[PDB]
Amino acid sequence: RICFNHQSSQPQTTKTCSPGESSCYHKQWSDFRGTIIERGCGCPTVKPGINLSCCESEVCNN
Amino acid sequence: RICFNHQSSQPQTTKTCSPGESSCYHKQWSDFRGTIIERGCGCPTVKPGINLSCCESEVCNN
């Protein structure tokens, strides 16, 4: 599985996930800077209020 | 939980999921006609070749 791992509006970067991993994630919140996005491999648990998205296809998390 | 349940780029419609359901889904594939989007409550099982995205927030599946 290949997942995007770039932050917010940065130039797109990718990461090859560890074997057995079939999910990519998109985590969004806000700070003084504006809209923040964290991307990676997997599907982590987030604190209430944080928007989370998980997908199961190559570079599905833009 | 409230999720979008409209197809492709058709007028937006939502659906009230059953209690306990915290997920919304976004499934995308391409038939002879091209890109097709399907939305709803939960996070269903999908066939290989169809891109599934599940999110956990109100009408998160646009």
From Swiss-Prot, chains A, B:
Location of the region described as Stretch between loop I and loop II in the Swiss-Prot/TrEMBL record: 18-23
This chain's source organism reads Laticauda semifasciata (Black-banded sea krait)
Q: In which tissues is it expressed?
A: Expressed by the venom gland.
Places the protein is found: Secreted
What's one GO MF term for it? ion channel regulator activity
UniProt similarity note: Belongs to the three-finger toxin family. Short-chain subfamily. Type I alpha-neurotoxin sub-subfamily.
Give site residues, Key residue for binding to acetylcholine receptor.
8, 10, 27, 33
Q: What's the protein here called?
A: Erabutoxin c
Q: Does the record carry Lipid biosynthesis as a key word?
A: no
Q: What is its main location?
A: secreted
Region (Loop II) residue ranges read 24-41
Q: Where is this site: Very important residue for binding to acetylcholine receptor?
A: 7, 29, 31, 36, 38, 47
Moderately important residue for binding to acetylcholine receptor (site feature) positions = 6, 9, 25, 32, 34
> What is the annotated role of this protein in its UniProt record?
Binds to muscle nicotinic acetylcholine receptor (nAChR) and inhibit acetylcholine from binding to the receptor, thereby impairing neuromuscular transmission. Binds to Torpedo marmorata nAChR (Kd=0.14 nM).
- Portion of the parent chain present: 22 to 83 of 83
**Sequence segments annotated as region (Loop III):** 43-54
Superkingdom, taxonomy of origin: Eukaryota
Ordered alphabetically, the record's keywords are: Acetylcholine receptor inhibiting toxin, Disulfide bond, Ion channel impairing toxin, Neurotoxin, Postsynaptic neurotoxin, Secreted, Signal, Toxin
Q: Which GO terms describe its cellular component?
A: extracellular region
User: What cystine pairs are annotated?
Assistant: 3-24, 17-41, 43-54, 55-60
